[PDB]
Amino acid sequence: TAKALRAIIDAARRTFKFRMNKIGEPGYSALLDFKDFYLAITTDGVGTKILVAEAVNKFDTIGIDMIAMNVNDLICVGAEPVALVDYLAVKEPNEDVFQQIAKGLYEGAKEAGIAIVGGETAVMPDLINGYDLAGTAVGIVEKDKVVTGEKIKPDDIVIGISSSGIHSNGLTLARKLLIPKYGLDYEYNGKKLWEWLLEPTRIYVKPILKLINEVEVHGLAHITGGGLLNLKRLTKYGFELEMPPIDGIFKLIYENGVPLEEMFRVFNMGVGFMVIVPQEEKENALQILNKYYESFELGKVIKEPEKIKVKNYGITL
Amino acid sequence: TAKALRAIIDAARRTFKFRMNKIGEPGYSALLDFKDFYLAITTDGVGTKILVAEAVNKFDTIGIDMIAMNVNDLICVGAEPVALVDYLAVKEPNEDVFQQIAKGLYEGAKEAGIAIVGGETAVMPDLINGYDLAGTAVGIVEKDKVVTGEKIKPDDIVIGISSSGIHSNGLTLARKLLIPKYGLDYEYNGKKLWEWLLEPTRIYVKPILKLINEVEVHGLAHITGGGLLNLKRLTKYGFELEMPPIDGIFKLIYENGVPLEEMFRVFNMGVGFMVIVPQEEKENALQILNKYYESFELGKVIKEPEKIKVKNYGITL
Numbered sequence: 001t002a003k004a005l006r007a008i009i010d011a012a013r014r015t016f017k018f019r020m021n022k023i024g025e026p027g028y029s030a031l032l033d034f035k036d037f038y039l040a041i042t043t044d045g046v047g048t049k050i051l052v053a054e055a056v057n058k059f060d061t062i063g064i065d066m067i068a069m070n071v072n073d074l075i076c077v078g079a080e081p082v083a084l085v086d087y088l089a090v091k092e093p094n095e096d097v098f099q100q101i102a103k104g105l106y107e108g109a110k111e112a113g114i115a116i117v118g119g120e121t122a123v124m125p126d127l128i129n130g131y132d133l134a135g136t137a138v139g140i141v142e143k144d145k146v147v148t149g150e151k152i153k154p155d156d157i158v159i160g161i162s163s164s165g166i167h168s169n170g171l172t173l174a175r176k177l178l179i180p181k182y183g184l185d186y187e188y189n190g191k192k193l194w195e196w197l198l199e200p201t202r203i204y205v206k207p208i209l210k211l212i213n214e215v216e217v218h219g220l221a222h223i224t225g226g227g228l229l230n231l232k233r234l235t236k237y238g239f240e241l242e243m244p245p246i247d248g249i250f251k252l253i254y255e256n257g258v259p260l261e262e263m264f265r266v267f268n269m270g271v272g273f274m275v276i277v278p279q280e281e282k283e284n285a286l287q288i289l290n291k292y293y294e295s296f297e298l299g300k301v302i303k304e305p306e307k308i309k310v311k312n313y314g315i316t317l
Numbered sequence: 318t319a320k321a322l323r324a325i326i327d328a329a330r331r332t333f334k335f336r337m338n339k340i341g342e343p344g345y346s347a348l349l350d351f352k353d354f355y356l357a358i359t360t361d362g363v364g365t366k367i368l369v370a371e372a373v374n375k376f377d378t379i380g381i382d383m384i385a386m387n388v389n390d391l392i393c394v395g396a397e398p399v400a401l402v403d404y405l406a407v408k409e410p411n412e413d414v415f416q417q418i419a420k421g422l423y424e425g426a427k428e429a430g431i432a433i434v435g436g437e438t439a440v441m442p443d444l445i446n447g448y449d450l451a452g453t454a455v456g457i458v459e460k461d462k463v464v465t466g467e468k469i470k471p472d473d474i475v476i477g478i479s480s481s482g483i484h485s486n487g488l489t490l491a492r493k494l495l496i497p498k499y500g501l502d503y504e505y506n507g508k509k510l511w512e513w514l515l516e517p518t519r520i521y522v523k524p525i526l527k528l529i530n531e532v533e534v535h536g537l538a539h540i541t542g543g544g545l546l547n548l549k550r551l552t553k554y555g556f557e558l559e560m561p562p563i564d565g566i567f568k569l570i571y572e573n574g575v576p577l578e579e580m581f582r583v584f585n586m587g588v589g590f591m592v593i594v595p596q597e598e599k600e601n602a603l604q605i606l607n608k609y610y611e612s613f614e615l616g617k618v619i620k621e622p623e624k625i626k627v628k629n630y631g632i633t634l
């Protein structure tokens with residue numbers, strides 16, 4: 001997958017010269033230079049989570065997943081999400097399924113504060129054997145307000161916001177590991193396996209925008225595919241983290257042979273979003289974020305570069 | 318398909334209020350209000366043309382189709398295309414196929430003058446049984462420079478630019494009509510059937526941008542899905558057209574039972590793009606456009622509203 005994909009990436013980077021000294025030149029998401037502001041643009045699909053949706057005929061939350069994966073990446077550079085367009089490829093245009101998908105699309109756009117301004121629907125029964133949903137979102141951020149990670153310095157404090165559902169990359173691993181052994185109808189800690197796998201991810205637009213406007217913010221990380229590795233990419237300095245105790249479906253996955261080291265490189269492990277603020281702003285940040293979702297101190301940026309030290313687990317990434 | 322799709326469209330329009338009195342409010346493509354300019358955004362996929370690409374193992378032009386369908390819609394409102402992101406869903410990550418797709422993506426971005434700034438690739442063999450390519454493009458247009466069609470008035474002259482390949486909607490009809498009877502290897506007028514069906518559509522960015530900057534332009538129509546109906550949507554006035562003679566694969570399709578009336582509602586019939594200019598600017602416009610592709614006078618806007626009169630065919634749409 002990686003070898004083949006690099007042909008697309010390498011061709012794309014060669015097109016950057018076509019906007020050199022032109023409006024919208026490119027500089028989580030791509031930033032386009034519109035002189036008065038950066039336009040941030042990102043693309044993402046739900047992945048194989050729509051397979052579980054199809055098995056239980058529940059599509060009213062998969063649109064939240066698609067919007068969340070897009071808008072949570074936009075806000076990482078400090079951009080305010082503005083609009084989204086979706087790509088829906090289907091085997092057959094089922095009226096009830098489309099009505100279900102539309103419900104989650106509306107609810108997701110509401111929480112993200114965005115308009116769904118267009119898209120395309122492709123009925124291709126010889127090309128699609130089920131349902132495929134993806135989307136592109138655009139946001140705006142002032143030039144002197146981009147959150148890059150350069151301001152991150154040792155002694156900065158890392159704050160985590162609790163997560164909801166599972167992302168597509170980790171969901172692929174959970175499906176092969178848990179479904180053949182337990183079945184979708186297996187009840188684990190009050191929730192059936194398909195409910196654990198179908199549960200929509202969380203939209204963090206509203207608390208993060210309020211945080212940026214009220215608190216000095218140095219770093220913003222969407223804990224999606226890659227787990228804690230999304231935190232390494234922000235800064236060259238290292239981290240000293242005390243992750244929350246393993247719980248929920250992550251506990252069942254860990255009990256089924258996935259090592260802790262790989263748990264934190266694939267799953268969110270209870271933290272869907274991370275923010276980095278100066279030491280003094282801890283109480284200010286925690287008070288704001290907790291008005292929306294449960295937020296807690298995770299650790300700090302340390303001088304020892306690169307490595308993340310998960311203290312209560314003894315893990316180094 | 319239409320009944321189910323309206324659930325998505327109706328939900329999307331209900332999200333417009335989420336940007337009311339906010340930056341990027343929405344107002345061929347959607348126009349977002351960024352106060353200093355409109356951001357135009359559009360989405361489109363190649364459709365079933367990638368099925369022919371898979372049959373002959375030729376993918377080095379399908380990326381041109383995807384870019385063309387996006388950027389040709391952007392320029393219809395007068396927007397300069399700026400960037401594109403693509404969505405690639407595949408059964409298997411074939412290294413040679415990805416390298417082929419990348420070649421057409423580069424060439425298409427070059428002709429369109431855009432950067433490919435991102436995207437997502439989804440290897441989902443249980444969801445995709447082949448290859449699926451789509452994309453979203455963004456452009457910029459000043460507020461007082463949008464080409465809406467309101468300036469179109471009777472006696473304005475319609476100019477056509479010659480087309481290249483077939484669009485996805487008409488390609489679906491051609492596939493079922495011609496492949497079982499003739500086979501992909503059937504040679505028709507110097508080109509095999511798969512070559513007629515796989516031939517990439519034309520990118521019109523460069524001539525249309527030059528036209529807008531040098532000539533007074535009242536209307537711009539991308540002749541895609543819908544044929545001449547894309548011209549009706551520009552203005553309430555009617556048209557008096559002399560379309561070019563039927564030729565190429567369109568002639569073979571017409572010989573196989575599709576009536577002329579439906580030919581002009583589905584296929585481009587030799588004109589991929591149309592422009593509407595004041596009567597006086599005919600020679601000015603034709604001289605500019607012909608530096609790029611073959612361009613010719615088609616007719617004029619008339620007082621008798623709505624109806625298009627194809628004079629050399631006796632067709633009314």
Ligand SMILES: Nc1ncnc2c1ncn2[C@@H]1O[C@H](COP(=O)(O)O)[C@@H](O)[C@H]1O
Nearest residue numbers: 086087088117118119120121325326329
């Ligand atoms: N899946 C979708 N979500 C939102 N809008 C759509 C979708 N598919 C089509 N549209 C809109 O439908 C209109 C024309 O549909 P079509 O040209 O058939 O794709 C345009 O305004 C599109 O943006």
Ligand SMILES: Nc1ncnc2c1ncn2[C@@H]1O[C@H](COP(=O)(O)O)[C@@H](O)[C@H]1O
Nearest residue numbers: 008009012403404405434435436437438
């Ligand atoms: N099909 C694609 N075309 C262009 N860029 C892509 C594509 N897929 C992934 N990328 C880029 O690859 C980087 C990360 O890949 P991933 O997070 O695995 O999607 C981002 O810069 C994406 O924009």
Ligand SMILES: [Cl-]
Nearest residue numbers: 068069072201
């Ligand atoms: Cl997400």
Ligand SMILES: [Cl-]
Nearest residue numbers: 166167267268
């Ligand atoms: Cl996850």
Ligand SMILES: [Cl-]
Nearest residue numbers: 385386389518
């Ligand atoms: Cl096109």
Ligand SMILES: [Cl-]
Nearest residue numbers: 483484584585
């Ligand atoms: Cl066509």
Ligand SMILES: [Zn+2]
Nearest residue numbers: 019020021025
């Ligand atoms: Zn530059």
Ligand SMILES: [Zn+2]
Nearest residue numbers: 044045168437
């Ligand atoms: Zn993804």
Ligand SMILES: [Zn+2]
Nearest residue numbers: 044069073224
């Ligand atoms: Zn993402």
Ligand SMILES: [Zn+2]
Nearest residue numbers: 095096320321
């Ligand atoms: Zn019905």
Ligand SMILES: [Zn+2]
Nearest residue numbers: 142143144145
């Ligand atoms: Zn400022």
Ligand SMILES: [Zn+2]
Nearest residue numbers: 151216217218
């Ligand atoms: Zn600071």
Ligand SMILES: [Zn+2]
Nearest residue numbers: 072201202224
């Ligand atoms: Zn997430």
Ligand SMILES: [Zn+2]
Nearest residue numbers: 278279280281
């Ligand atoms: Zn102080």
Ligand SMILES: [Zn+2]
Nearest residue numbers: 280281282284
């Ligand atoms: Zn303070």
Ligand SMILES: [Zn+2]
Nearest residue numbers: 282283284287
């Ligand atoms: Zn206090």
